[PDB]
Amino acid sequence: KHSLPDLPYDYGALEPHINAQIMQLHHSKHHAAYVNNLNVTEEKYQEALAKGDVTAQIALQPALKANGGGHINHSIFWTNLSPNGGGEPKGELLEAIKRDFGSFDKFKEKLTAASVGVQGSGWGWLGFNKERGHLQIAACPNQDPLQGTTGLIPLLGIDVWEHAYYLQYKNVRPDYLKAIWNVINWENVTERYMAC
Amino acid sequence: KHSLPDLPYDYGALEPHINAQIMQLHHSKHHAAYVNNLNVTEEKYQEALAKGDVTAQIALQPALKANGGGHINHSIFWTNLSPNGGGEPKGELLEAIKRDFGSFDKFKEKLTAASVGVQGSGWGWLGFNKERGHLQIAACPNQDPLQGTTGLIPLLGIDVWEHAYYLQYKNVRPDYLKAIWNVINWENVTERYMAC
Amino acid sequence: KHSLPDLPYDYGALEPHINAQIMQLHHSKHHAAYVNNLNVTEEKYQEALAKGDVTAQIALQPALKANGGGHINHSIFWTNLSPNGGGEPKGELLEAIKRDFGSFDKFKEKLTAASVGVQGSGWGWLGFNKERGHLQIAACPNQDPLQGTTGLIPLLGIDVWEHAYYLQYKNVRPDYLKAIWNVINWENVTERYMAC
Amino acid sequence: KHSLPDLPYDYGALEPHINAQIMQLHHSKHHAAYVNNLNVTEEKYQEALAKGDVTAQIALQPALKANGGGHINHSIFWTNLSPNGGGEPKGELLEAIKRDFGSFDKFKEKLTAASVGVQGSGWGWLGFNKERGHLQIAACPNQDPLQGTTGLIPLLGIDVWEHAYYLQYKNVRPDYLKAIWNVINWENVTERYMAC
Ligand SMILES: [Mn+2]
Ligand SMILES: [Mn+2]
Ligand SMILES: [Mn+2]
Numbered sequence: 001k002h003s004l005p006d007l008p009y010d011y012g013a014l015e016p017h018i019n020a021q022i023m024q025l026h027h028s029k030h031h032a033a034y035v036n037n038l039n040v041t042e043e044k045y046q047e048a049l050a051k052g053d054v055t056a057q058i059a060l061q062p063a064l065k066a067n068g069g070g071h072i073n074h075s076i077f078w079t080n081l082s083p084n085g086g087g088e089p090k091g092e093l094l095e096a097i098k099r100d101f102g103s104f105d106k107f108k109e110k111l112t113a114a115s116v117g118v119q120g121s122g123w124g125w126l127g128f129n130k131e132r133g134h135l136q137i138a139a140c141p142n143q144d145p146l147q148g149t150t151g152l153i154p155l156l157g158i159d160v161w162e163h164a165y166y167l168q169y170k171n172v173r174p175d176y177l178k179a180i181w182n183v184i185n186w187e188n189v190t191e192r193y194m195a196c
Numbered sequence: 197k198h199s200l201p202d203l204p205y206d207y208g209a210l211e212p213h214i215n216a217q218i219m220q221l222h223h224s225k226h227h228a229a230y231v232n233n234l235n236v237t238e239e240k241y242q243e244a245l246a247k248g249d250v251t252a253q254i255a256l257q258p259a260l261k262a263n264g265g266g267h268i269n270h271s272i273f274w275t276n277l278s279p280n281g282g283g284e285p286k287g288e289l290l291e292a293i294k295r296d297f298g299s300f301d302k303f304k305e306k307l308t309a310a311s312v313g314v315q316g317s318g319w320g321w322l323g324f325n326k327e328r329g330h331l332q333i334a335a336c337p338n339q340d341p342l343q344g345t346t347g348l349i350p351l352l353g354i355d356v357w358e359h360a361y362y363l364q365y366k367n368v369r370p371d372y373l374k375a376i377w378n379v380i381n382w383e384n385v386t387e388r389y390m391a392c
Numbered sequence: 393k394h395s396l397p398d399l400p401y402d403y404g405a406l407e408p409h410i411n412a413q414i415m416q417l418h419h420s421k422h423h424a425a426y427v428n429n430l431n432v433t434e435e436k437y438q439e440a441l442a443k444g445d446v447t448a449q450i451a452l453q454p455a456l457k458a459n460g461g462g463h464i465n466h467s468i469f470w471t472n473l474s475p476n477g478g479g480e481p482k483g484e485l486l487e488a489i490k491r492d493f494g495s496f497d498k499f500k501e502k503l504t505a506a507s508v509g510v511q512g513s514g515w516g517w518l519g520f521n522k523e524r525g526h527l528q529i530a531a532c533p534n535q536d537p538l539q540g541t542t543g544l545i546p547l548l549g550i551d552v553w554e555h556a557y558y559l560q561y562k563n564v565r566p567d568y569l570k571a572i573w574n575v576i577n578w579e580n581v582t583e584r585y586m587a588c
Numbered sequence: 589k590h591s592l593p594d595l596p597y598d599y600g601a602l603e604p605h606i607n608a609q610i611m612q613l614h615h616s617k618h619h620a621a622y623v624n625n626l627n628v629t630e631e632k633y634q635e636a637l638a639k640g641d642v643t644a645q646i647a648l649q650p651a652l653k654a655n656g657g658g659h660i661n662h663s664i665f666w667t668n669l670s671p672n673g674g675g676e677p678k679g680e681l682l683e684a685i686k687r688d689f690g691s692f693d694k695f696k697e698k699l700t701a702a703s704v705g706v707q708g709s710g711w712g713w714l715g716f717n718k719e720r721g722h723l724q725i726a727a728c729p730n731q732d733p734l735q736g737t738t739g740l741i742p743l744l745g746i747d748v749w750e751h752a753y754y755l756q757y758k759n760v761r762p763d764y765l766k767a768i769w770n771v772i773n774w775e776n777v778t779e780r781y782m783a784c
């Protein structure tokens with residue numbers, strides 16, 4: 001009941017910031033595997049739940065989180081990028097950013113730092129805290145999804161698993177983060193922000 | 197669809213090793229809460245699963261593990277104790293213990309050490325590793341169940357959450373562990389061992 | 393080089409909200425053990441560090457965190473309580489609370505919820521986020537200290553390990569939390585707040 | 589006081605199983621960073637320890653584990669590989685493997701499964717359990733070192749962070765694991781085994 005979403009653009013549309021080979025592998029191999037594994041896991045959980053097998057439900061948690069999170073995270077990621085992206089946001093989002101981070105540049109700095117600081121695999125996120133009513137930066141390990149594990153509503157995510165940049169930027173994660181700002185789809189981030 | 201099991205003996209049957217007040221609170225308050233919370237959580241999960249809400253499924257994992265594990269762990273614990281317990285096991289179990297731990301006393305020592313070493317709340321377990329075909333000692337945090345999180349089949353469990361001994365032994369966990377050996381139901385442990 | 397601090401009041405000074413037996417055990421047994429274990433652990437770390445034994449340094453991390461955190465957490469806790477406490481804070485602290493939580497009652501509600509929600513052993517905290525310049529509520533597991541693990545400056549802490557309330561309130565954690573508000577030393581919380 | 593070890597062979601010595609570009613980046617960039625970060629972290633810890641700053645000691649734990657583990661893990665990894673490796677072990681090691689895993693092929697299968705199953709970044713290990721006196725397979729997340737976190741003595745490690753294989757094998761981790769068996773230095777694994 002979960003499917004791989006089509007990319008809203010061509011695999012080479014984000015060049016030269018993110019090359020076509022990475023986009024193709026990331027989408028058709030990595031994301032595809034997560035969706036397929038997610039469907040298999042949910043079916044097993046339905047069976048475990050149906051017979052009240054608590055042990056089986058708990059044993060399946062890691063797989064569900066990794067694959068469920070993998071699907072969620074990448075689905076949002078594709079919409080966060082655009083060949084027509086880059087620049088700075090405008091309107092309320094920009095004001096919210098100035099209000100919570102001081103300036104757009106300080107925000108970029110904070111999110112970049114959080115993303116580069118991830119030890120191992122993970123994601124850097126700009127999220128919305130509905131309880132406090134303000135923007136918040138958070139980093140999640142592996143495929144742990146933002147909302148499901150922290151309660152924050154995801155607005156913008158940056159994948160820092162090595163498969164997201166290694167072929168092009170190798171070990172230099174900072175170079176990858178510097179380039180991704182040129183393809184951020186602020187129109188989508190704004191939409192997500194307005195929704196909450 | 198999950199219910200609180202009746203105790204196979206009277207609340208004061210384990211005196212003076214574990215007093216009646218602890219047994220009554222442990223069973224009718226602590227275990228009861230876990231069962232009730234477990235049923236509420238599974239119902240929510242059925243709904244989340246039915247509409248493919250992955251975020252909701254992941255957000256419910258901690259509650260399901262804590263309450264599901266709470267029910268599983270305590271259910272086994274009650275069967276591991278008996279007013280007619282104590283002493284040493286016999287037959288194959290005893291041989292398996294001598295074979296994997298050297299002697300019964302060394303086994304007691306190892307399980308005691310693992311149980312007293314738990315920082316915070318948790319359980320000490322004597323489990324069976326089906327893959328290796330031998331006995332194994334493990335400690336689990338909070339209510340994380342043995343089988344669901346490690347794959348080991350539970351044979352004997354020792355609850356070291358403070359509510360399991362504080363009223364009677366206060367901060368002296370070692371005194372609690374020394375006394376519990378007098379009420380271990382080796383007949384039940386043997387049954388669980390033979391089953392796998 | 394670490395020592396057990398003397399209590400700023402008599403063990404029975406917080407009656408009837410927290411009885412003397414709990415205060416005596418909590419301070420002279422629980423806190424004392426953490427201090428002694430902390431000193432032993434730091435000495436071992438000095439030796440490991442001196443010979444560049446990285447493996448030994450890493451193996452000692454859990455003990456240092458549990459005992460180091462145990463000492464830190466309880467030291468702050470004793471100063472957070474007072475036989476002359478209770479009521480509501482005043483001045484800037486009160487304003488900060490109204491500003492970040494809406495009202496004092498909503499704040500109490502939020503901190504209570506965070507404290508009762510801890511699965512297993514842990515602490516509920518009212519802390520200060522120096523980066524954002526606002527108050528924040530957080531819950532830490534076992535003895536993990538607030539500042540050392542989250543970066544937040546601790547202002548008020550509530551111990552929810554079962555040994556902190558079981559003898560008097562048994563399994564009813566909510567009753568314990570309701571009573572502790574009568575002995576909060578707002579003068580100390582204010583001091584900690586003004587310092588940062 | 590920690591230094592980057594020289595590789596016991598040329599960067600292209602493991603071709604075609606592991607290409608020269610990966611070996612060069614892995615050693616001169618990845619491992620080098622860990623060593624440098626480790627030295628900086630230990631110096632900070634010496635200062636924290638000297639003034640009894642427990643908070644600072646705890647805040648530094650993640651960095652020490654990641655960088656300390658990074659150095660330890662890679663140092664062992666380089667010695668586990670050889671242009672003259674491959675094939676099967678002999679002598680006592682082979683017997684121990686047959687005894688604990690059934691056969692060499694079953695062992696390869698078990699270690700491969702553990703390595704491919706790592707979600708995110710991590711390592712697959714063949715270790716020795718001194719307490720039980722037998723071989724054991726374990727998987728560690730990120731740079732968490734084997735001995736420091738599990739107590740097992742490391743004999744053979746397989747790096748499954750994506751930087752260890754992505755440039756050559758892309759997303760196909762199984763292809764990487766199949767190829768690495770051709771360059772395992774069984775002479776070194778045997779030495780480590782005999783030492784314990
Ligand atoms: Mn990715
Ligand atoms: Mn219990
Ligand atoms: Mn305490």
Ligand SMILES: [Mn+2]
Pocket residue numbers: 614618662747749751752
């Ligand atoms: Mn590596």
